[PDB]
Write an enzyme that holds these catalytic residues in place. Structure first.
Site, PDB file in Angstrom:
ATOM      1  N   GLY A 193      -3.950   5.974 -12.747  1.00 31.79           N
ATOM      2  CA  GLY A 193      -4.322   6.563 -13.948  1.00 31.79           C
ATOM      3  C   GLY A 193      -4.636   8.331 -13.583  1.00 31.79           C
ATOM      4  N   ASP A 194      -4.801   8.250 -12.035  1.00 35.11           N
ATOM      5  CA  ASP A 194      -5.637   9.304 -12.007  1.00 35.11           C
ATOM      6  C   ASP A 194      -5.487   9.537 -10.435  1.00 35.11           C
ATOM      7  OD1 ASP A 194      -7.463  11.789 -11.968  1.00 35.11           O
ATOM      8  OD2 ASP A 194      -9.058  11.035 -10.635  1.00 35.11           O
ATOM      9  N   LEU A 195      -3.828   9.475 -10.161  1.00 32.05           N
ATOM     10  CA  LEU A 195      -3.307   9.676  -9.296  1.00 32.05           C
ATOM     11  C   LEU A 195      -2.711  11.184  -8.350  1.00 32.05           C
ATOM     12  CD1 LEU A 195      -2.179   7.834  -6.548  1.00 32.05           C
ATOM     13  CD2 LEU A 195       0.055   8.128  -7.678  1.00 32.05           C
TER      14      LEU A 195
END
Ligand SMILES: [Cl-]
Ligand SMILES: [Cl-]
Length: 288
Positions: A193-195
């Site tokens: 989700g925040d890669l």
């Protein structure tokens, strides 16, 4: 670092703490390397003593780490203990990126994603940094993405005056075209989700992923985030990923679409710097 950190870790893990060192801050919390009596190092996030904190913030990460971490060769750190104020996990000693690690990381990510999810979203309330992130379970991606990943941040940025009415209309054009632009339905993936590159800690044998905003999402999201701010050996990671869980046809053309969510979050959190990239990416999505 805190004698209070040390106490909280011992309570949460049941293990004796030998040392605490400060490792800076992120948003509203402080970072530490904490060493147990046997030498085991832990990475610890902690809100200060007594500080008011966002409802369910640490929970989202603790639960997201647990949920995301159930795949073969998982790149997710193990959690040693947590509560609403404190999160103690495995410490990672970073290594320079290598093409060998990149290939291995591609496989790790594929297995992580293909663990799969019952729906888009999650059973816990979400965050993306300090901002709420709506994890309400949904069965179809275009609706989930528009209503829970795009519109809330678009409205917020517009309200703060970071985006113009024309910018908003441009993003709304993409949303109106979304049931063509989306490509074909596929099952929800377990996504980080925040890669982006700063949340990838390279190892000799792959990489470790940190600071998740984990949920059921489109697996293309994570790969598009790797692309957005770049990654060492990106093509080797994607090639190795595609060996084992090939992306649906036309994925390259859909990269901008999947970058709209993170870009809107950045405009919300960090301001104007990211506006032109948002606009350019929206335009690119429209003509994809
Ligand atoms: Cl110990
Ligand atoms: Cl490469």
């Amino acid at each position: 670092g805190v004698n209070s950190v040390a106490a909280r870790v011992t309570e949460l893990t049941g293990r004796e703490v030998a040392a605490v060192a400060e490792r800076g801050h992120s948003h509203r919390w402080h970072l530490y390397r904490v060493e147990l009596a046997d030498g085991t190092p832990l990475f610890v996030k902690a809100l200060p003593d007594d500080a008011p904190a966002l409802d369910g913030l640490f929970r989202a990460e603790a639960l997201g780490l647990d949920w995301l971490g159930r795949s073969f060769g998982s790149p997710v750190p193990q959690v040693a203990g947590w509560d609403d104020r404190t999160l103690a996990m495995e410490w990672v000693d970073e290594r320079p990126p290598t093409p060998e690690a990149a290939e291995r990381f591609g496989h790790q990510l594929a297995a992580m994603h293909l663990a799969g999810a019952e729906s888009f979203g999650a059973t816990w309330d979400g965050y993306i940094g300090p901002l709420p992130m709506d994890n309400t379970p949904r069965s179809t991606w275009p609706e989930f993405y528009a209503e829970q990943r795009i519109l809330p941040y678009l409205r917020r940025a517009a309200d703060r005056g970071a985006l113009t009415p024309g910018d908003v209309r441009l993003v709304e054009k993409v949303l109106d075209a979304l049931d063509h632009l989306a490509g074909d339905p596929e099952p929800p993936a377990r996504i980080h989700g925040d890669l982006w590159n700063g949340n990838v800690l390279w190892q000799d044998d792959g990489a470790v992923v940190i600071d998740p905003a984990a949920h059921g999402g489109h697996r293309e999201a994570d790969l598009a985030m790797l692309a957005l701010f770049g990654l060492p050996y990106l093509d080797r990671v994607r090639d190795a990923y595609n060996e084992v869980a090939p992306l649906a046809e036309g994925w390259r053309a859909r990269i901008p679409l999947h970058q709209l969510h993170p870009l809107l979050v950045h405009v919300c959190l960090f301001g104007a710097a990211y506006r032109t990239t948002l606009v350019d990416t929206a335009r690119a999505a429209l003509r994809a």
